[PDB]
């Protein structure tokens, strides 16, 4: 991915793509700024799965590191309650694994409201849980 | 449509990038 790029995040045949992009996040783990750079290269894709994977990648990058700014919060909150259960399904999980030990009320105040709404599958509800 | 959302994400990315840059700059300023 790093280097050539755009090759093992494509030809992954639809749904697997959502995780392939997340792989980037796990390579740039604990590296918020480098995360930002490489992920943002891939955070703007014509197909939903890439954007979901990039959001999950941001969550992974911010996992375990308590940045004073909240990159995960901003980027992934823009896409929580999105009109698609695939950007929701990566942003919710990214926030979950980005602010795990945090116990912050401001992220739960954004997550709890999404388990209940007509526009949420069991997948989205379970990932919010 | 999705393009406005992309623009907003662009702006968020840029703001956070500058914020982290100054964060690390002032962190280095003591170290």
From Swiss-Prot, chain A:
Disulphide linkage map: none
Tissue expr: Found in skeletal muscle, liver, heart, brain, kidney, pancreas, lung and placenta.
Intervals holding PC repeats: 19-52, 53-89, 90-124
Subunit-structure text: Component of the 19S proteasome regulatory particle complex. The 26S proteasome consists of a 20S core particle (CP) and two 19S regulatory subunits (RP). The regulatory particle is made of a lid composed of 9 subunits, a base containing 6 ATPases and few additional components including PSMD2. Interacts with RPGRIP1L. Interacts with CRY1 in a KDM8-dependent manner.
Record family assignment: Belongs to the proteasome subunit S2 family.
Function text: Component of the 26S proteasome, a multiprotein complex involved in the ATP-dependent degradation of ubiquitinated proteins. This complex plays a key role in the maintenance of protein homeostasis by removing misfolded or damaged proteins, which could impair cellular functions, and by removing proteins whose functions are no longer required. Therefore, the proteasome participates in numerous cellular processes, including cell cycle progression, apoptosis, or DNA damage repair.
Protein name: 26S proteasome non-ATPase regulatory subunit 2
Organism: Homo sapiens
Gene name in the database record: PSMD2
Residues represented out of the complete protein: 391 to 519 of 908
Curated annotation (Swiss-Prot), chain B:
Localization: Nucleus, Nucleolus; Nucleus; Cytoplasm, Cytosol
Function: Facilitates the ubiquitin-independent proteasomal degradation of stimulus-induced transcription factors such as FOSB, EGR1, NR4A1, and IRF4 to the proteasome for degradation. Promotes also the degradation of other substrates such as CBX4. Plays a role in inhibiting the activity of glucokinase GCK and both glucose-induced and basal insulin secretion.
Domains (record comment): Contains three domains that function in concert to promote proteasomal degradation of bound substrates. Contains a ubiquitin-like domain (Ubl) toward its N-terminus that is necessary to promote substrate degradation. In the middle, two domains termed Catch1 and Catch2 are necessary and sufficient to interact with unstructured regions within substrates. The long C-terminal region associates with the proteasome.
Subunit composition and interactions: Interacts with GCK; the interaction occurs preferentially at low glucose levels. Interacts with the proteasome.
Name of the protein in its database record: Midnolin
Source species: Homo sapiens (Human)
Lineage: Eukaryota, Metazoa, Chordata, Craniata, Vertebrata
Gene: MIDN
Residues of the full protein shown: 380 to 410 of 468
């Amino acid at each position: 991915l790093t280097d050539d790029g755009n090759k093992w995040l494509y030809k992954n045949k639809d749904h697997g793509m959502l995780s392939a992009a997340a792989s980037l996040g796990m390579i740039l783990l604990w590296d918020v700024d480098g995360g930002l750079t490489q992920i943002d290269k891939y955070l703007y894709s014509s197909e939903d799965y890439i954007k979901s994977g990039a959001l999950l990648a941001c969550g992974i990058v911010n996992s375990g590191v308590r940045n004073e700014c909240d990159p995960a919060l901003a980027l992934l909150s823009d896409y929580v309650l999105h009109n698609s259960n695939t950007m929701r399904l990566g942003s919710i999980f990214g926030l979950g694994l980005a602010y795990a030990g945090s116990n912050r009320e401001d992220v739960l105040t954004l997550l709890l409201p999404v388990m209940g709404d007509s526009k949420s599958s069991m997948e989205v509800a379970g990932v919010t849980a | 449509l999705r393009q406005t959302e992309n623009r907003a994400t662009r702006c968020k990315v840029e703001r956070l990038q500058l914020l982290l840059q100054q964060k690390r700059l002032r962190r280095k300023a003591r170290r």
